[PDB]
Amino acid sequence: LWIRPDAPSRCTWQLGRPASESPHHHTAPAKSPKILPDILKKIGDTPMVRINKIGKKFGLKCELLAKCEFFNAGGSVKDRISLRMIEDAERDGTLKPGDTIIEPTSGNTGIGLALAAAVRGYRCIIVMPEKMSSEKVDVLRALGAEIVRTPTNARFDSPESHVGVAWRLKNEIPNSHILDQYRNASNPLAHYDTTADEILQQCDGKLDMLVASVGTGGTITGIARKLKEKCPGCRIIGVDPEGSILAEPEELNQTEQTTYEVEGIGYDFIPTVLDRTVVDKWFKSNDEEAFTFARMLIAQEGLLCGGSAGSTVAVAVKAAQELQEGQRCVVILPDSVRNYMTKFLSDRWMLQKGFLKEEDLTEKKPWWWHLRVQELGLSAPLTVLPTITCGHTIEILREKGFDQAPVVDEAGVILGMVTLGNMLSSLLAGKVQPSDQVGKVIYKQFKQIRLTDTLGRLSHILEMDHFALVVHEQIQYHSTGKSSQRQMVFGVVTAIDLLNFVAAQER
Amino acid sequence: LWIRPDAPSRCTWQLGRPASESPHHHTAPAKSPKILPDILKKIGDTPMVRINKIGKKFGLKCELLAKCEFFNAGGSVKDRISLRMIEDAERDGTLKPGDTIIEPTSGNTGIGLALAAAVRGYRCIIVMPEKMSSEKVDVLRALGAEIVRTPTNARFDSPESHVGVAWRLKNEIPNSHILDQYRNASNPLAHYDTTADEILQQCDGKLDMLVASVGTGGTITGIARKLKEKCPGCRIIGVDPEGSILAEPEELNQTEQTTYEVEGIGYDFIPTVLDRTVVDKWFKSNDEEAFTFARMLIAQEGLLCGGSAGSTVAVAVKAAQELQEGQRCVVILPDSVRNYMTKFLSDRWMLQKGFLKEEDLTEKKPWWWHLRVQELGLSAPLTVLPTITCGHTIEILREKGFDQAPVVDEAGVILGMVTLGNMLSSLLAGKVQPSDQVGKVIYKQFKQIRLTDTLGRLSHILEMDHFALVVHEQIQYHSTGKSSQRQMVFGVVTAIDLLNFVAAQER
Amino acid sequence: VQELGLSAPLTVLPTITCGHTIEILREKGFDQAPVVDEAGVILGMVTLGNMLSSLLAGKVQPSDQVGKVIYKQFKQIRLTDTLGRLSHILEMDHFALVVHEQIQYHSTGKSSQRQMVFGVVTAIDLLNFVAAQER
Ligand code: HEM
Ligand code: HEM
């Protein structure tokens, strides 16, 4: 009953055959009106961005271009797929309003279909492998679509795979569909009708190479067929993650790990729409190579593009090494960074998975990075209690000659810090009166830092909080049966003082 | 030495004066090139989207339109400001490459300037109040810009306010520019030259109303002056958060809360660029309405927009009640949802800050939501130890009619669960052999659930993990202190079984 | 002087028994700890090596309090003072107890004073610091 997704294609398209032989409907990429009837019309005509620093740094003689396909409605290149598939299904009459649309997804197809459903009222059921970020869940719950997860390492044909659950669901609930992104011909057709046309029109149809990731089979086949039909000289590369079976010939697939940390590319089967014959050479790329290039993309060109583009530019800085002056390289950037905010963008996760190493983290930092905070000029001869009046504090601080002081309880529990200037501004503004206690103007946000920690830790703490209260704590022993813990503020540091210290040491 | 940001405007503009009197260069928009020379050219000509369900539900007789200004490069409506200010500064010659650009910001001018700096090489320092989400800190770090935080509740005039820290830095770091978004005339001028032109051209200049947030002063003044000059009949409204001072007349500001949870609107002063007299009427909006309307925007129109796009439509569903058929309402949606993923999009945070009550989150749920999980048909008659061979397991399970079994160690620790269907596929694929132990096929991830928790908790657990292992644990006492713990797998439930139960009970 | 490896994570009260001290300092990996009264007034220092020798000599017993072996004399030094001042202090006294004192205000006149031991430095540590920094 169930239909495999890896079955060989029945398609009969072959290079050189005129489009008049196409059994499939072709949609005109007509320009959208001046007022989009709804968000779904903001899918198409994404910009073609020239990329400067990466191409120059790694010795690319040819102009390197990137097709930014992360400014679609949902933020991905799986938003042409949802629109095209829904349009075609409704046109052919296979679907009616109010139906339930099940769709196994590698990620962004889930978001695209959820958005289209929420706009047109369909009840959507998305099935995702368990490895996908939670940021692709929080953006689905808000859309209201149901979400079902499947085990990460289940082989596609087994019942627990992320297509086995989808097909079983389609049988339990009546009046439900599976648009089947793996097999539907509308998947690559969307690209063959819009993605290829836009590239050809923008680049004047004179591009001597292309790159593109894989994992659906659409972004590569749908573009390759048109490019070879109208731009025969284009060398159409591929990509794949080390651990997938899509890449050919078999020699490049000889690695064993069954899971990889790039979300959206590679698979353990050949999708039916994947027209491999159009590829001209397959590379591979591995997690760290992808993340350490996504970070540098963001940092050096402002292209806010996510993980699956790191691999796609990594492969470019190799495959195009043989190009010469006057030729153009075109790449595809599948998705926006919004789906990886807790992933590789987070230093913590990058170091935890070791795609960076600490020496890489420090080599790029100025000289003073390793100096211990103990070396700064910091002190706090005075302290204040929370019960004092603001009128009393304004005189105490000035008569002592200090502009700020910590606020501590009777025993040592730090509560916050108070500053003269803010207190005076509050008094003048009338928000508090001199008789009023300081409890209404005390700064309650701060973070402790201990003397040993390097200035690097201080600089990574000031990114969250203005005040870094240097403190020291002691355990006191009575008889091993009674003990107490105590701490005392030992001066505070702030970005102002840190930069002043760096300047003074430099000067 | 330091210059206040709230000083009265020195501008002499007044309705009806010819444009030839403008002392400021106007950057007339021109058709964008087919290949953007870099990302900074994807700033302008964002779509205009009619909004269907919100307008109809709340009795808006008029066409309600939205200007989606969250498809700019940085994902915000503060990306025209960053581009325009940098370009004008360079044109004036006040700036040279390699300089340090310090800018106090509410969070989105920060990202815009960080992008427009990392593209051109400037060393950017961004000062930002502590209240802004960490999801902007993460996106700033990747861009490599220095970041400095300031206390949340510091009065603007105090030295510890974000403007104060910005000016103190500028006064000490050599070769440093402070573009001062609050005072620069380019801030509103950018909108007056581009934002107004696009709205006028798209909407045919026949809009009888407008809405817009405030907090910078630019989005409203810049659009308002042009709309009044060329579309005199537009009824221009403002907005503001309860707790801010920008709103007029003063009678509306009589509230005492000094902090509000919307990021980027309102302030404790009147920015100089804010040309208030162009407003025709003001309102206020409070946190809960804004967040609820942001959620009900996302869930019902696919317009992915963040917190400040909630207030800007909650205000519309009131101010436009007086409109009639045939007239157009235009709103401004500042930012993209990428900056709030941990915030209101997260049910956890929403409930924690109580902007939703549990009954609100439970009313719309189907009937079975309150049933207890023990209501389901669930059992686990047998178990297997990890040391068993796959050959043994495939014969144990098939003979009894069962197809899956938990994996339990000798003591009782749950290790994982194995499915017969996946084991057979693994054997056929050659990844394992019958002599091999199950350690290579055991699913590693699952989540526990106890018999008392409702099916709602189960449905919120299945959004993260395929398997929900219904377990049970008992504490056992030998004699008082010599306690011990034990746990057993009672039954396993999956989305398939939950949906099947719902269907069977319904039928 | 703040450039040294000065530290003092723990402290003891004068009434503690010597057995408790010999066990605490060893189980915590340290060998010396300041003796601080309840109010925070520094009283002296106690060292594991001397206490163990005293136990073996019979001058004290494990149940005995540390009051009979506490070192009585020292001299305070504040973190701002140069190593020259520390060297001219160590010519008179073995222990230089680095401390910090704070005035705490309830309301102007109703003031109070507090202090704590931030670290202890001795000629051994000073010379070792010089040697390591040079090398
Ligand atoms: C000369 C033009 C074309 C010819 C002769 C052609 C022929 C066909 C035919 C007869 C089928 C139905 C096969 C079946 O139902 O068993 C088919 C399906 C399909 N075609 Fe085409 N078609 C053309 C255009 C295109 C184009 C432009 C694309 C993509 C760029 C495409 C991709 C596909 C795909 C993916 C399928 C479905 C394969 C499957 O479901 O296994 N076709 N084609
Ligand atoms: C008839 C057209 C205009 C006239 C007569 C005019 C006149 C002036 C003058 C003389 C100044 C300098 C004031 C000073 O340096 O103290 C100024 C600044 C300024 N103008 Fe215009 N200008 C025009 C166009 C515009 C437009 C189109 C905008 C916004 C849409 C604008 C907003 C501003 C702002 C924000 C300032 C800065 C005020 C300050 O920094 O204190 N002006 N204008």
Tokens read off for A305 = 């593009």
User: After which residues do gaps appear in chain A, with C to N over 2.5 Å?
Assistant: none
B308 is in an annotated binding site: yes
Check CB contact under 8 Å for A462 and B149. yes
Which of A396, A470, A477 to probe the C interface (max C CBs under 10 A)? Answer: A477
Which of A39, A168, A291 to probe the B interface (max B CBs under 10 A)? Answer: A39
Among A3, A6, A9, A13, name the best residue to mutate to test ligand 1's pocket (greatest count of ligand atoms within 8 A of Cβ).
A13
A116 secondary structure, DSSP code: H
Q: A269 CB less than 6 Å from ligand 1?
A: no
Residue with tokens 């089947």: A180
Which residue from B minimizes the CA distance to A157?
B425
Of A385, A477, A478, the CB nearest to C105: A385
Strands of A142-296 (E only): list them. Answer: 146-150, 176-178, 209-210, 235-238, 281-282
Q: B226 CB less than 6 Å from ligand 2?
A: no
User: Using CA atoms, how far apart are residues A361 and B25, in angstroms rounded to an integer?
Assistant: 44
Q: Residues B293, B314: contact at Cβ < 8 Å?
A: yes
User: Using CA atoms, how far apart are residues A233 and A224, in angstroms rounded to an integer?
Assistant: 11
Report the DSSP pairing between strands B176-178 and B100-104.
parallel
Check CB contact under 8 Å for A49 and B65. no
Chain A residues with beta carbon closer than 8 angstroms to that of C4: none
Residue spans of alpha helices (H) in chain C = 18-27, 48-57, 83-90, 123-134
Crossing angle between the packed helical segments A420-429 and A390-400, to the nearest 10 degrees: 140
B302 is in an annotated binding site: no
Residue with tokens 């049970």: B472
User: Using CA atoms, how far apart are residues A439 and A490, in angstroms rounded to an integer?
Assistant: 22
Tokens read off for A322 = 């043989």
- 10 Å CB burial of residue B102 (0-12, 13-18, 19+) is buried
Q: How many CA atoms lie within 13 A of B485 on its CB side?
A: 4
Contacting subunits of A (3+ beta carbon pairs below 8 A): B, C
User: How far, in Å, are B98, B165, B169, B496, C44 from residue A494 at the CA level?
Assistant: 25, 10, 12, 55, 36
Q: Residues A388, A416: contact at Cβ < 8 Å?
A: no
Long-range contacts of A286-293, Cβ-Cβ distance < 8 Å, separation of 24 or more: A286/A241, A286/A242, A286/A260, A287/A241, A287/A260, A287/A261, A287/A262, A287/A353, A287/A355, A288/A355, A289/A314, A290/A241, A290/A262, A290/A314, A291/A261, A291/A344, A291/A350, A291/A355, A292/A355, A292/A356, A293/A317
Q: How far is A375 from chain C (nearest CA, A)?
A: 6
Residue with tokens 């004399």: C73
Residue spans of alpha helices (H) in B353-507 = 358-363, 390-400, 420-429, 455-461, 495-506
Does A418 contact B at CB distance below 8 Å?
A: no
Among A9, A11, A192, name the best residue to mutate to test ligand 1's pocket (greatest count of ligand atoms within 8 A of Cβ).
A11
A346 secondary structure, DSSP code: S
Q: B3 CB less than 6 Å from ligand 2?
A: no
User: How far, in Å, are A233, A294, A299, B338 from residue A337 at the CA level?
Assistant: 33, 10, 13, 9
User: Using CA atoms, how far apart are residues C69 and C32, in angstroms rounded to an integer?
Assistant: 13
Measured in angstroms, the resolution is 3.9
Check CB contact under 8 Å for A381 and C101. yes
User: Cα(B229) to centroid of ligand 2, in Å?
Assistant: 15
DSSP B392-417: HHHHHHHHHT--EEEEE-SSS-EEEE
User: Using CA atoms, how far apart are residues A48 and A61, in angstroms rounded to an integer?
Assistant: 19
User: Using CA atoms, how far apart are residues B415 and B471, in angstroms rounded to an integer?
Assistant: 12
Does B119 contact A at CB distance below 8 Å?
A: yes
Does B206 contact A at CB distance below 8 Å?
A: no
Q: How far is B284 from chain A (nearest CA, A)?
A: 21
Which residue from C minimizes the CA distance to A487?
C116
Residue with tokens 């109703």: C110
Check CB contact under 8 Å for A65 and B35. yes
CA B287 to chain centre: 14
Which atom of ligand 2 sits closest to the CA of residue B183?
40
DSSP B296-311: HHHHHH-----THHHH
Q: A23 CB less than 6 Å from ligand 1?
A: yes
Sign for the pseudo-dihedral over CA of B423, B429, B431, B435 = positive
CA B467 to chain centre: 30
User: Using CA atoms, how far apart are residues B443 and B418, in angstroms rounded to an integer?
Assistant: 6
Local structure of A95: helix, strand or coil: coil
Give Dmax over CA atoms of chain B in angstroms.
95
Check CB contact under 8 Å for A422 and B160. yes
User: Using CA atoms, how far apart are residues A459 and B137, in angstroms rounded to an integer?
Assistant: 13
Q: A223 CB less than 6 Å from ligand 1?
A: no
Catalytic residue list contains A78 = yes
Contacting subunits of B (3+ beta carbon pairs below 8 A): A
Strands of A280-437 (E only): list them. Answer: 281-282, 328-333, 382-384, 404-408, 414-419
B330 secondary structure, DSSP code: E
Number of residues assigned to chain A: 507
User: Using CA atoms, how far apart are residues A272 and A503, in angstroms rounded to an integer?
Assistant: 63
User: How far, in Å, are A77, A492, B158, C99 from residue A469 at the CA level?
Assistant: 47, 5, 20, 18
Chain A residues with beta carbon closer than 8 angstroms to that of B48: 34-36
Method: cryo-EM
**Among the options B67, B78, B136, B170, which is catalytic?**
B78
Tokens read off for B116 = 């427009």
CB neighbour list of residue A401: distance below 8 Å, 6 or more residues apart: none
User: Using CA atoms, how far apart are residues A146 and A156, in angstroms rounded to an integer?
Assistant: 22
Sign for the pseudo-dihedral over CA of A397, A402, A407, A411 = negative
Q: A16 CB less than 6 Å from ligand 1?
A: no
Contacting subunits of C (3+ beta carbon pairs below 8 A): A
Q: Which ligand is nearest to the CA of B21?
A: 2
Check CB contact under 8 Å for B151 and A496. no
For residue A123, the cross-strand partners are A100
User: Using CA atoms, how far apart are residues A292 and A281, in angstroms rounded to an integer?
Assistant: 24
User: How far, in Å, are A43, B57, B313, C88 from residue B51 at the CA level?
Assistant: 17, 11, 10, 81
Chain A residues with beta carbon closer than 8 angstroms to that of C20: 477, 479-480
SS3 content of chain C, % helix, strand, coil (to 5): 30, 30, 40
Which of A126, A138, A171, A436 to probe the B interface (max B CBs under 10 A)? Answer: A138
B445: number of Cβ within 10 Å: 16
Tokens read off for A8 = 């060989």
**Among the options A78, A136, A170, A343, which is catalytic?**
A78
CB neighbour list of residue A141: distance below 8 Å, 6 or more residues apart: A147, B345, B347, B463
A195 secondary structure, DSSP code: I
Q: B13 CB less than 6 Å from ligand 2?
A: yes
Q: B222 CB less than 6 Å from ligand 2?
A: yes
User: How far, in Å, are A161, A237, A284, B250 from residue A221 at the CA level?
Assistant: 25, 11, 18, 63
CB neighbour list of residue A460: distance below 8 Å, 6 or more residues apart: none
User: Using CA atoms, how far apart are residues A71 and A79, in angstroms rounded to an integer?
Assistant: 10
B274: number of Cβ within 10 Å: 25
